[PDB]
Design an enzyme around this catalytic site. Structure first.
Site, PDB file in Angstrom:
ATOM      1  N   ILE A 250      14.486   0.568 -24.236  1.00 31.65           N
ATOM      2  CA  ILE A 250      13.961  -0.668 -23.719  1.00 31.65           C
ATOM      3  C   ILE A 250      13.775  -1.789 -24.671  1.00 31.65           C
ATOM      4  CG2 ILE A 250      13.175   0.476 -21.729  1.00 31.65           C
ATOM      5  CD1 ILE A 250      10.394   0.629 -22.881  1.00 31.65           C
TER       6      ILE A 250
ATOM      7  N   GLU B  91      13.517  -3.038 -29.191  1.00 31.50           N
ATOM      8  CA  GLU B  91      13.532  -2.927 -30.718  1.00 31.50           C
ATOM      9  C   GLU B  91      12.704  -3.931 -31.318  1.00 31.50           C
ATOM     10  OE1 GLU B  91      17.674  -3.922 -31.290  1.00 31.50           O
ATOM     11  OE2 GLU B  91      18.220  -1.750 -31.510  1.00 31.50           O
ATOM     12  N   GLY B  92      11.783  -3.082 -32.092  1.00 28.10           N
ATOM     13  CA  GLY B  92      10.659  -3.978 -32.730  1.00 28.10           C
ATOM     14  C   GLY B  92      11.086  -4.247 -34.376  1.00 28.10           C
TER      15      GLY B  92
ATOM     16  N   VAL C 132      12.743   1.411 -32.805  1.00 26.15           N
ATOM     17  CA  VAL C 132      13.250   1.423 -31.496  1.00 26.15           C
ATOM     18  C   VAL C 132      12.309   1.805 -30.457  1.00 26.15           C
ATOM     19  CG1 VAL C 132      14.271   3.628 -31.680  1.00 26.15           C
ATOM     20  CG2 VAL C 132      15.260   1.840 -30.153  1.00 26.15           C
ATOM     21  N   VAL C 133      12.434   1.317 -29.202  1.00 27.77           N
ATOM     22  CA  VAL C 133      11.377   1.618 -28.188  1.00 27.77           C
ATOM     23  C   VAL C 133      12.040   2.242 -26.836  1.00 27.77           C
ATOM     24  CG1 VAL C 133       9.306   0.949 -26.445  1.00 27.77           C
ATOM     25  CG2 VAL C 133       9.916  -0.182 -28.844  1.00 27.77           C
TER      26      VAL C 133
ATOM     27  N   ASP D 248       8.285  -8.191 -20.755  1.00 31.89           N
ATOM     28  CA  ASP D 248       7.680  -8.967 -21.503  1.00 31.89           C
ATOM     29  C   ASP D 248       7.754 -10.499 -21.119  1.00 31.89           C
ATOM     30  OD1 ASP D 248      10.034 -10.635 -22.418  1.00 31.89           O
ATOM     31  OD2 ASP D 248      10.493  -8.833 -23.818  1.00 31.89           O
TER      32      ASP D 248
ATOM     33  N   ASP E 126       1.084 -11.688 -35.362  1.00 33.03           N
ATOM     34  CA  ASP E 126       2.304 -11.779 -35.200  1.00 33.03           C
ATOM     35  C   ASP E 126       2.369 -12.153 -33.440  1.00 33.03           C
ATOM     36  OD1 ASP E 126       5.082 -12.321 -35.679  1.00 33.03           O
ATOM     37  OD2 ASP E 126       5.405 -10.493 -35.569  1.00 33.03           O
TER      38      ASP E 126
ATOM     39  N   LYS F 153       3.816 -13.185 -30.106  1.00 35.53           N
ATOM     40  CA  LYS F 153       4.952 -14.115 -29.544  1.00 35.53           C
ATOM     41  C   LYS F 153       5.109 -13.455 -28.041  1.00 35.53           C
ATOM     42  CE  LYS F 153       7.116 -10.838 -32.539  1.00 35.53           C
ATOM     43  NZ  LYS F 153       7.731 -10.865 -33.987  1.00 35.53           N
TER      44      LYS F 153
ATOM     45  N   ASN G  27       5.963  -9.806 -27.212  1.00 35.01           N
ATOM     46  CA  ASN G  27       4.987  -8.851 -27.282  1.00 35.01           C
ATOM     47  C   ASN G  27       3.652  -9.133 -26.319  1.00 35.01           C
ATOM     48  OD1 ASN G  27       3.272 -10.545 -29.042  1.00 35.01           O
ATOM     49  ND2 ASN G  27       4.256  -9.450 -30.840  1.00 35.01           N
TER      50      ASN G  27
HETATM   51  C1  LIG Z   1      13.396  -6.216 -23.350  1.00 40.11           C
HETATM   52  N1  LIG Z   1      12.674  -6.919 -22.673  1.00 40.11           N
HETATM   53  S1  LIG Z   1      12.067  -6.750 -21.094  1.00 40.11           S
HETATM   54  O1  LIG Z   1      13.379  -6.300 -20.487  1.00 40.11           O
HETATM   55  O2  LIG Z   1      11.316  -7.958 -20.861  1.00 40.11           O
HETATM   56  C2  LIG Z   1      10.852  -5.369 -21.327  1.00 40.11           C
HETATM   57  C3  LIG Z   1       9.975  -5.492 -22.193  1.00 40.11           C
HETATM   58  C4  LIG Z   1       9.120  -4.614 -22.268  1.00 40.11           C
HETATM   59  C5  LIG Z   1       9.165  -3.177 -21.470  1.00 40.11           C
HETATM   60  N2  LIG Z   1       8.201  -2.324 -21.423  1.00 40.11           N
HETATM   61  C6  LIG Z   1       7.450  -1.836 -22.430  1.00 40.11           C
HETATM   62  N3  LIG Z   1       6.319  -1.255 -22.176  1.00 40.11           N
HETATM   63  C7  LIG Z   1       5.613  -0.975 -23.164  1.00 40.11           C
HETATM   64  C8  LIG Z   1       5.818  -1.219 -24.648  1.00 40.11           C
HETATM   65  C9  LIG Z   1       4.833  -0.882 -25.570  1.00 40.11           C
HETATM   66  C10 LIG Z   1       5.328  -1.342 -26.700  1.00 40.11           C
HETATM   67  C11 LIG Z   1       6.513  -2.023 -27.110  1.00 40.11           C
HETATM   68  C12 LIG Z   1       6.941  -2.240 -28.481  1.00 40.11           C
HETATM   69  O3  LIG Z   1       6.746  -1.493 -29.343  1.00 40.11           O
HETATM   70  N4  LIG Z   1       7.506  -3.618 -28.760  1.00 40.11           N
HETATM   71  C13 LIG Z   1       7.723  -3.871 -30.243  1.00 40.11           C
HETATM   72  C14 LIG Z   1       8.623  -4.884 -29.994  1.00 40.11           C
HETATM   73  C15 LIG Z   1       7.959  -5.750 -29.009  1.00 40.11           C
HETATM   74  C16 LIG Z   1       7.209  -4.588 -28.214  1.00 40.11           C
HETATM   75  C17 LIG Z   1       5.744  -5.038 -27.870  1.00 40.11           C
HETATM   76  C18 LIG Z   1       7.286  -2.364 -26.026  1.00 40.11           C
HETATM   77  C19 LIG Z   1       6.898  -2.116 -24.578  1.00 40.11           C
HETATM   78  N5  LIG Z   1       7.844  -2.539 -23.747  1.00 40.11           N
HETATM   79  C20 LIG Z   1      10.126  -3.297 -20.560  1.00 40.11           C
HETATM   80  C21 LIG Z   1      10.415  -1.989 -19.558  1.00 40.11           C
HETATM   81  C22 LIG Z   1      11.164  -4.350 -20.428  1.00 40.11           C
END
Ligand SMILES: CNS(=O)(=O)c1ccc(Nc2ncc3ccc(C(=O)N4CCC[C@@H]4C)cc3n2)c(C)c1
Length: 288
Positions: free
Chosen positions: A11, A13-14, A18-19, A78, A119, A121, A124
């Site tokens: 879902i 990439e930080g 990867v997430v 997001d 950071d 944005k 996040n």
């Molecule tokens: C692809 N953009 S979306 O398509 O709108 C999108 C964005 C987020 C998510 N849900 C999600 N949930 C919890 C997280 C908890 C943490 C993180 C995480 O480690 N990060 C590092 C990089 C930024 C993000 C906060 C991501 C999460 N992402 C989904 C299903 C779709």
């Protein structure tokens, strides 16, 4: 360890890893699982107790092998994707107001515990279908730092960086997150990034061209900062009526105080929650 988690799909990439959307086979929970390839253990562990309704919950830290796994509550999307979806129509101001009010609540909580994000944005800031918005990746910067490029070599964005960071301060305060949120607030309102720089100096000079080149009057001590150069061009400040039309005067007042140059003059999250702009704040349901 990881045997308890079934990856569903990638879902995101930080900067660090990867997430995945994953299913916890022990609990039935759907979570977001971040894998980081490899002081941090203790600092990250502290973050598990930083629980607030506008902070993405860190469910678990699993340390096995040469890898760190962070398990998060799962959110729908997001803010960057939502802003892009609303490019034609704009996000309605009541929803903008609600999102800003909620993030300031998150910030006031973290800042009260002397945790900064560093950071912020749109990517996040995560939303659900109820109308909630939450701060994600909170405190993970103090551990490893913020790199020039992510683990995929994508360029880390400078658009929301506070000017004291860009000027080379290494002992900056909670005010840096207020700056970043002010930039995001402006972007929701106008549907354009406020300062979309593509280098540190382009970023600094875009700030200067809108807010005026800072001097010792508006920012005592600025001319002694590590990366300040007397040869910076001297630009005049623009009026906020040009910067964020058609935000009303309460909103412009709030935004200007979030974008003060001097970190000690910049409004706190707690004082921002008392600003009259939020007199009529509500919690609308978003159309995702
Ligand atoms: C692809 N953009 S979306 O398509 O709108 C999108 C964005 C987020 C998510 N849900 C999600 N949930 C919890 C997280 C908890 C943490 C993180 C995480 O480690 N990060 C590092 C990089 C930024 C993000 C906060 C991501 C999460 N992402 C989904 C299903 C779709």
């Amino acid at each position: 360890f990881m045997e308890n988690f079934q990856k569903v799909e990638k879902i995101g990439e930080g900067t660090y890893g990867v997430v995945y959307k994953a299913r916890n086979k022990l609990t039935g929970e759907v979570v977001a699982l971040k894998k980081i390839r490899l002081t941090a253990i203790r600092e990250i562990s502290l973050l598990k107790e930083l629980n607030h309704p506008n902070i993405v919950k860190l469910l678990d830290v699993i340390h096995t092998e040469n890898k760190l796994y962070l398990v998060f509550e799962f959110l729908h999307q997001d803010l960057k994707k939502f802003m892009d979806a609303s490019a034609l129509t704009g996000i309605p101001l009541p929803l903008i107001k609600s999102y800003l009010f909620q993030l300031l609540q998150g910030l006031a909580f973290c800042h009260s515990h002397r945790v900064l994000h560093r950071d912020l944005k749109p990517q996040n800031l995560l939303i659900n279908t109820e109308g909630a918005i939450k701060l994600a990746d909170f405190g993970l910067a103090r551990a490893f730092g913020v790199p020039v490029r992510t683990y995929t070599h994508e360029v880390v964005t400078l658009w929301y960086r506070a000017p004291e960071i860009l000027l080379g301060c290494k002992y900056y305060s909670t005010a840096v997150d207020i700056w970043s949120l002010g930039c995001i607030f402006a972007e929701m309102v106008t549907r354009r990034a406020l300062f979309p720089g593509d280098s540190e100096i382009d970023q600094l000079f875009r700030i200067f061209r809108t807010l005026g080149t800072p001097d010792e009057v508006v920012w005592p001590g600025v001319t002694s900062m590590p990366d300040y150069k007397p040869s910076f061009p001297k630009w005049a400040r623009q009026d906020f009526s040009k910067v964020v039309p058609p935000l009303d005067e309460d909103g412009r007042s709030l935004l200007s105080q979030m974008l003060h140059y001097d970190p000690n003059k910049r409004i706190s999250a707690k004082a921002a929650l008392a600003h009259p702009f939020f007199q009529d704040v509500t919690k609308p349901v978003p159309h995702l």
